């Protein structure tokens, strides 16, 4: 109910009555294959069902504004600190093809030993709480009826309170999440015994909710010197979490590998990343492939980011990818802006559509230099696995710095990340379950002595209480706000003003930022400082340079500048004809 394609989202209204909101559906959705689809004068081989409302590609004007959609689910990542502004960037991405909206947790959420409540302002991410999650999921319910195709809300289930957020995600119909207890150990130095004992519960709750699970082996892609040498260990991090998730109870069809082509030009990156792509997909049949794009070998140039990304979409098309996430071309220039999340979608859609049917016409030379390396990577990984058993198990391997070592395994440099078994964040927080331990709720993993109270209820523990919150939502304690001055209602109040003036923004309403591109006939450093001046004179504030490119040392320099416009315009004093 509501939503007119020409009226903005009433984010004031969406925020009301969040105490009575309920997710409209549960779990993951994929795209509907649309066989031999006919759009305009064309027939598509690898397309999915068309959107009912969307923004087609500029050049779709030469073809009746057709908007072909490829088969893979398409991710965009949007988390600015203010979930309330981002609900608008969501609507723009949705119109541009994104049906997987993924939200980054506010800095340090990994270390929150419990849920947080309400809506404080984030730092380099949204703080994930129930109100905020109910809010954004309520807005996506609207946005997905508008476009005419469901949208998977996604977030992160890490930290020393993974199990905590797993529940809340389960209750509030979050469709997908990251979950890989290796992330906690390697990157956040959470303690390994507690981290993995926690993931059992986390994952069970996630399997109950039918959620899709993305891992974090690709993380080792970044924090890594020469990324092509990390390929045996990727297979090892992908395998551990997968066989793990599998034996917990999670379905194989809901387990996604998070797989990024490790290189980018000027390396021969296709040649390097393709045997790996094939090796992985052969070794992990029946598991999902969530392709991500390159972030490590990125820089200040959007143009360059895009070209590397198209090659990334090319690795996916030559092989297989059930989800094709994207990265903004400006990722290395600044924090993603509305217009650049949209570029990411457009580009992902444009490339995939142009390669429609490509594999009816092209194929892999499966024997040759290709099959040899497919075979070698597989051997190297198996070797790595053999050594992790020899050293007597996963904890000992971690503690010996087996992981995050910059060596092309079996090669070991000794520069890997060693965590202590007995140390870390949350050491000494594991407790042995006793003989009479019990837990009266659905989706519990470990030893649960239920017989004692009723031998019949063994398989329905929550019936000891006539439903846990998973059966009885009205048992959910909803917190609204816990801070009177740091919350969404203050932030929205701050700028009533604007909702009949107007100004430019990149992330937050009326933030006044804009981008300036220029060419200067001098060397870079000077060119850069001369560049600031021009911007100042142009009345911009908080001016800073975000990209320099040498055209040629003496002849010239391209400079790019982000700056703030210190004034407003009025829509009512604009002379506009017909």
């Amino acid at each position: 109910l509501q939503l007119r394609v020409n009226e903005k989202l009433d984010v004031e209204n969406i925020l009301k009555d969040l105490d009575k909101y309920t997710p409209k559906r549960r779990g993951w959705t994929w795209r509907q294959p649309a066989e031999n689809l006919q759009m305009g004068p064309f027939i598509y081989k690898d397309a999915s069902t068309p959107l009912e409302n969307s923004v087609a590609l500029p050049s779709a004007k030469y073809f009746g504004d057709i908007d072909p959609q490829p088969l893979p689910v398409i991710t965009t990542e949007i988390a600015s600190g203010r979930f309330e502004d981002d609900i608008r960037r969501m609507r723009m991405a949705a119109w541009h093809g994104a049906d997987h909206i993924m939200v980054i947790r506010t800095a340090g959420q990994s270390h929150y030993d419990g849920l947080i409540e309400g809506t404080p302002q984030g730092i380099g991410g949204v703080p994930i709480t129930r109100k905020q999650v109910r809010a954004q999921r309520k807005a996506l319910d609207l946005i997905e009826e508008e476009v005419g195709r469901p949208i998977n809300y996604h977030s992160y289930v890490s930290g020393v309170a993974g199990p905590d957020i797993a529940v809340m995600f389960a209750e509030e119909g979050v469709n997908g999440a990251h979950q890989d207890p290796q992330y906690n150990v390697l990157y956040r130095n959470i303690n390994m015994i507690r981290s993995f004992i926690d993931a059992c519960e986390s994952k069970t709750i996630m399997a109950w909710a039918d959620m899709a699970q993305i891992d974090g082996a690709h993380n080792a892609n970044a924090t890594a010197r020469e990324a092509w040498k990390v390929m045996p260990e990727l297979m090892v991090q992908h395998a551990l979490n997968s066989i793990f998730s599998l034996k917990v109870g999670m379905k194989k069809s809901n387990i996604c590998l998070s797989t990024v082509p490790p290189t980018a030009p000027p390396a021969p990156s296709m040649y390097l990343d393709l045997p790996y792509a094939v090796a992985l997909r052969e070794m992990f049949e029946g598991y999902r492939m969530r392709a991500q794009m390159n972030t490590k070998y990125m820089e200040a140039s959007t143009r360059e980011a895009t070209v590397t990304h198209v090659l990334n979409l090319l690795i996916s098309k030559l092989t297989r990818a059930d989800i094709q996430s994207t990265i903004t071309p400006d990722e290395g220039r600044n924090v993603p802006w509305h217009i650049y999340n949209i570029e990411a979608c457009d580009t992902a859609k444009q490339a995939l559509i142009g390669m429609d049917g490509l594999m009816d016409m092209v194929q892999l030379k499966r024997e040759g230099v290709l099959g040899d390396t497919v075979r070698e990577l597989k051997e190297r990984a198996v070797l790595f696995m053999e050594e992790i058993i020899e050293a007597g198990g996963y904890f000992n391997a971690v503690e010996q710095g087996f992981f995050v070592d910059s060596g092309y395994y079996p090669e070991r440099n000794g520069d890997g990340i060693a965590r202590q078994i007995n140390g870390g964040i949350g050491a000494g927080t594991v407790f042995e379950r006793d003989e009479d331990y019990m837990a009266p709720v659905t989706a519990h993993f470990g030893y649960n002595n239920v017989k004692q109270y009723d031998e019949a209820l063994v398989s329905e523990p929550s019936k000891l209480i006539d439903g846990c919150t998973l059966e009885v939502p009205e048992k959910i304690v909803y917190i609204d706000e816990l801070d009177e001055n740091d919350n969404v209602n203050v932030r929205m109040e701050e700028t009533k003003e604007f909702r009949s003036m107007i100004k430019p923004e990149v992330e937050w309403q009326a933030d006044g930022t804009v981008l300036l591109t220029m060419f200067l006939p001098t060397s870079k450093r000077v060119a850069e400082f001369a560049a600031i001046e021009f911007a100042k004179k142009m009345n911009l504030e908080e001016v800073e340079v975000i990209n320099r490119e040498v055209m040629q040392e003496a002849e010239g320099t391209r400079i790019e500048l982000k700056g703030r416009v210190p004034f407003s315009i009025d829509i009512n004093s604009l002379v506009i004809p017909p």
Binding site: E282, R380, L383, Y394, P410, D434, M438, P440, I465, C468
Partner: protein, 109 residues
């Protein structure tokens, strides 16, 4: 180095090499899963409570207290179940009670 190491796989077939990769993957995660079956932690205990109809704030206090009295092994949602039945109150009320510092001498039996 790698050529020395790769000795015993060289004549393994693709099916054997794959089945071996997953065979060991399995043996590496098993001890992890067992650790998961026989033990518990605060976040797990808090999560059981959340499902049981407690707020994040209330859950913290119960598990924070459960740990003091050395009762984790029995289960925090269990402490709140046995005390509910024993004194004939609602699961909710007996969980509120406990959170506030009550029924703890009693729970110890």
């Amino acid at each position: 180095d790698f050529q020395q190491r790769r000795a015993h796989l060289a004549n393994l077939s693709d099916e054997e090499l794959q089945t071996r990769f997953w065979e060991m993957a399995e043996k590496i995660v098993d001890p992890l899963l067992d650790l998961g079956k026989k033990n518990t932690t605060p976040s797990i205990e808090r999560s059981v409570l959340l499902r049981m109809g407690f707020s994040s704030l209330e859950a913290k206090a119960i598990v924070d207290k459960t740990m003091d009295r050395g009762l984790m092994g029995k289960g925090a949602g269990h402490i709140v179940y046995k005390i509910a039945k024993e004194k004939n109150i609602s699961v909710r009320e007996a969980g509120l009670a406990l959170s506030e510092g009550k029924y703890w001498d009693d729970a110890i039996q």
